[PDB]
Swiss-Prot record:
Positions that bind NADP(+): 7, 13-19, 45-46, 63-64, 76, 95-102
Family: Belongs to the dihydrofolate reductase family.
Cited InterPro entries: DHFR, DHFR-like_dom_sf, DHFR_CS, DHFR_dom
Annotated pathway: Cofactor biosynthesis; tetrahydrofolate biosynthesis; 5,6,7,8-tetrahydrofolate from 7,8-dihydrofolate: step 1/1
Gene3D superfamilies: Dihydrofolate Reductase, subunit A
Outcome of mutating residue 85 to A: Decreases catalytic rate by one third. Increases catalytic rate about 7-fold
Positions of substrate binding: 5, 27, 52, 57, 113
Coiled-coil features, chain-numbered ranges: none
Record organism: Escherichia coli (strain K12)
Keywords: Antibiotic resistance, Methotrexate resistance, NADP, One-carbon metabolism, Oxidoreductase, Trimethoprim resistance
PROSITE patterns in the cross-refs: DHFR_1, DHFR_2
Protein name: Dihydrofolate reductase
Keyword NADP on entry: yes
Length: 159
């Protein structure tokens, strides 16, 4: 099973200038809980944005060019990325925009954080078709001293 996990600001913005400009510790904790002990697939730009391997996860990087770091696994196509995960129950696709586009048609589950923040950005999560997806979990949180925007954790499953 393939799942996508992402945090979306208003208008599906996910990034600006190869960064995420907000800081929501509660959402990073949610990301860690839902990805730990699973393989994670990311594109090369997202790898450069994170800047280091994510511990406790098999890190698989998509790039058309040879890898430059043997602490992670480098693959050259979507099918190779999936194969490199082996026989696991759930593969997590962690972006960015171009990678989400390619894996969306193959995904059964979306883990989305909706952040109440207006962000100028240059990268968006794909338009998906709402009729294809059932919301199976949602949890709203007001802003607090640690998290400066309100946010909604949602899990959607392909109908
Ligand atoms: N808010 C969130 O949830 C979230 C999550 C992830 C990322 N982001 C943000 O998203 C932005 C990065 O997204 P992006 O769309 O620019 O880039 P991306 O999807 O991270 O990376 C694209 C790169 O991945 C490689 N790639 C993708 N598909 C491939 C394929 N089928 N075969 C081979 N290589 C492939 C290519 O690398 P080569 O050029 O080396 O071939 C391509 O240039 C940043 O702003 C980041 O902060 C946000
Ligand atoms: N909901 C969501 N939020 C995100 O921030 C997110 N980020 C990415 C890609 N970028 C990043 C950037 C940093 C870290 C990171 O530092 N993660 C630590 C945080 C642990 C914690 O704060 O408790 C990790 O070990 O996962 C992960 C992904 C992909 N999907 C996402 N999905
Ligand atoms: Mn092929
Ligand atoms: Mn197999
Ligand atoms: Mn806000």
């Amino acid at each position: 099973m393939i799942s996508l996990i992402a945090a979306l600001a208003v208008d599906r913005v996910i990034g600006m200038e190869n960064a995420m400009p907000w800081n929501l510790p509660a959402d990073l904790a949610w990301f860690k809980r839902n990805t730990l002990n699973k393989p994670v697939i990311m594109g090369r730009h997202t790898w450069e944005s994170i800047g280091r391997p994510l511990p406790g996860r098999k890190n698989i990087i998509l790039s058309s060019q040879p890898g430059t770091d043997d602490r992670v696994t480098w693959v050259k196509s979507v099918d190779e990325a999936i194969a490199a995960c082996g026989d696991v129950p759930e593969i997590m696709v962690i972006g960015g925009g171009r990678v989400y586009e390619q894996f969306l048609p193959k995904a059964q589950k979306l883990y989305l954080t909706h952040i109440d923040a207006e962000v100028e950005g240059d990268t968006h999560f794909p338009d998906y078709e709402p009729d294809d997806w059932e919301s199976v979990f949602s949890e709203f949180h007001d802003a607090d001293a640690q998290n400066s925007h309100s946010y909604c954790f949602e899990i959607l499953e392909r109908r």
